[model samples]
Target chain A: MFEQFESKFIDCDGIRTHYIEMGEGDPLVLVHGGGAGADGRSNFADNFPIFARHMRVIAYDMVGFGQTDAPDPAGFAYTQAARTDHLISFIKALGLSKICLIGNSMGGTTACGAALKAPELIDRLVLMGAAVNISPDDMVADDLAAVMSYDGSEEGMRKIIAALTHSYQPTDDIVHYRHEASLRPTTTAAYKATMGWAKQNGLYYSPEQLASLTMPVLVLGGKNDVMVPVRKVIDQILAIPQAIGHVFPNCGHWVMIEYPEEFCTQTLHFFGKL
Target chain B: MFEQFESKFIDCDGIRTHYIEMGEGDPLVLVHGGGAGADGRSNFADNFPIFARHMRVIAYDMVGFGQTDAPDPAGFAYTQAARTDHLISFIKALGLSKICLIGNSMGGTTACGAALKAPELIDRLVLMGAAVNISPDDMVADDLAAVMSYDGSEEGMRKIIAALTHSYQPTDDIVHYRHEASLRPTTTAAYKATMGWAKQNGLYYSPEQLASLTMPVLVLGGKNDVMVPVRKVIDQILAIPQAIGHVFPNCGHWVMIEYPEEFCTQTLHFFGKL
Candidate 1:
């Protein structure tokens, strides 16, 4: 399955951007979530081929996650803001224009963040279990701590999988695979610094910022998702007239992995690619 | 599929209990949720045969809900407490002891209530997106209003299906079938009375009550559930020393229907039937 896609790199403003691309058509950039061992492949391996069957799909390692270059956190403020900028920079560096974008977890916010910052570079947008709405618990309680306590062990990665998903019991294939990504060059400190940055500064968009999104957006979340509030998702939908959404049942944070068929079908339908 | 099961009725404390039973083994009683058109069949149609294949499974309508006697809510209060008593009575009437009991939505609360009040009658218990914790929005807002507004129309049933499910698009078969059940003699008034009863006296179990549960309990909830808070489910889990739980991704209030295969597998595994 990995052989079906092309692994490549591009320099985005001196940052070595790693990405996977498959099939051909309108470019769809899938931004991976933020977590230990989280990368384009970890977040999207199962979805890559299924989505690639219809359109050109690119799932890239976001900065400070996956195999992407995690800049030195001492000088670099490893915040979601920096991540968003890195995402926009990645698209701009690819010289891709008017591409459809899909993001999960922090990636969802990144998708919207990119679209809001560089609307001309994006066409349709999809936010899957986005974390733009930061709860008070996310900073003060054990809610976000679940993702913060990644020890990079296979067991830790298993726990991370449990945190992000509703009932997906990760096999060793999944545990070992993503576990390797977490141990990548400086992935730990970067992930650690990223969570620290989030705790200090809440990860969220103001009402005005959310309302400013003008792209045709599809907001998706698992009905049983504990990571993001459904009311926030609905408020996002309500803010944008062009926005539509679905709260999938039996799912949690990872809609693409948990319910890939429904994710792809609805996503393509939203993009008018179905 | 419908032909595989036997539809039967039993008198439980004078309340006519309508139920479907199949196979023969340790009895597992499934209690349906409280809503328009909700019944043993409507809630567990897909699950009936699958569960029945393993053990003697019975899904019955509680008093005031399905084909069970809706003994005029004017004289008899159509409250959740009443529903709980009916459940306890149903188990006793069937002469079933140490039974594995499962409940959904309002039925979940009823399950807990019964186990708390009559611990010996139940063995292991599973609560699927239970409503033991009522929210501030449920009474004075659109939360419970969605279920309460059912007008006995097929369209109304379709809307109810949408409300109960996460992303299940109800078929004409489902809408028409459940709609027919909603229009059954006195189902509307009974459902209305049940909702009114809930609004007047918030449906909840005190922390002590939840903690008092002595049976091995499995507490389940949908993460993106608009109906119930996951915290309450956790509190329920934390309350019972023997309780375990799963917050299914991509699910809403109807865990049994939305993810039947996973639901059955995990549930049967819980019952040691796998």
Candidate 2:
């Protein structure tokens, strides 16, 4: 769906930025997971194609990811409010409002926080293997430290994907995808400082904001997923008053990619149910 | 799928007429419930497509249900041996052997009786929302009389569906599906004969007959179901040598039809996994 690779240097509190976009309909914003030098494409490439077919899917390289300008330590304010504001600014710059959101991992947290803060801007939500709590199987405190506080290296990338993927294979294709993403000149030292923000305030933020969202929500999670324990992810979202829950058995971590046809079918069905 | 209609008219001893077909593949001979004039297609049209998609699914109008030939009351004999013999003749005439038998309500008893009489032919079993041990539902002698004895009027059809369906207001499609099913030319006397059989034999069989089934069985009922409560069905099925269990929530007598997709998916997936 990508016609050309382009990045506009938008000012995110003096950090440069960019977002990937394709197709056109109701705008859909995709938020990627966290890791050293991990980009939106690296985290979400597997599920974005079909989504783009139906709606405008905008996935971006966050300040710490892809071609976006990384922040200095001073600019690395890794609190939920700051993350929410950053996402808000991203949407505002595109001149879009009341968009559907699809979020995974840390991106899920940021989007949820943003939605809570500015409910007026979000129209609907679809969460997949979302990182809502500090799951032991996912990122134990140590793994979180390694991810949030990383010295960017190929070795570090392998470890990150290992933790995220079910098979934890360091295959050439996956390594190549990450390697090229790391060379984007956007990932930086301040990106390494995100650990403190996540550790201190990640679980502290309440998703009670989504409770009032009477709009339909599709909460998808992998049964054997290790990255985000299904129970923890389900625990938080189950309270979303109008949310429908679907747990995919025989699937782990990357559910959308691993179980693409079923995933797409169910997601489309849930959306259509609205 | 509808064009596959075929039948064999049977005149067993004094009984006047009836018919059943041997299915395309390994057969699953269905026995009708004792309710008014229960039939195979009435209970299974929505369900057949799902199971038939994988393997051959066979069902027929029981004596009083569909287009089966009816007999005079003087000719009608209310005996399990007669029912069993009818099943055997139906199977032998059609040349369908190594069958997977499924029966509901009093049909379950007929299935057991048939399986007892002919063990080598019946390979597997699925007894669904069956009527076993009528005394379990706090059944007074009259409550038993009410179900077994009813004219097949529109109101009678509505009462049948109400008892059969979880919802009192069975959708017109479902009601008509069952009504049109039992409205065949020759089923009234046959239905009256089936009621007579139930009245004569109220749980009147040895445990040896129940325990004789040395084949795999899938005994299904609903947790919230009042008609064939899980306790009674489970207790009876567990008494058998080989049996597994499934309890559908928010369902009643109509397990496969009430939750056709889930029941079919589970049935197909279960067999596939084996």
User: lDDT tens string, model 1, A186-208?
Assistant: 88788878877776776678778
- The CAPRI category of model 1 is incorrect
The candidate that wins on TM-score is: 2
Error of 2 at A115 (Å): 3.6
Q: In model 2 chain B, which range of ten residues has the least summed lDDT?
A: B137-146
Q: Global lDDT for candidate 1?
A: 0.78
- CA error at residue A272 for candidate 1, angstroms: 20
Candidate 2 total steric clashes: 0
Question: Candidate 1, residues B1-274: lDDT per residue as tens digits?
Answer: 2555677889988898888888789999898887766888888888877888898998998888777888976788787778888999999988999999998878887888899899999898998778786753555646545566766677777777787677988777777778787787787788778877777787788777776888777777765566775555655555555555555555678888887976887688779885
Clashing pairs for predicted structure model 2, backbone only? none
Runs off by more than 4 Å, candidate 2: A1-4, A8-16, A133-156, A168-173, A179-188, A204-210, B1-274
- For every candidate structure, what is the RMSD over all alpha carbons to the true structure, in angstroms? 8.7, 9.8
Error of 1 at B137 (Å): 9.7
* Candidate 2 local Cα displacement, residue A43, angstroms: 1.9
* Fnat of candidate 1: 0.00
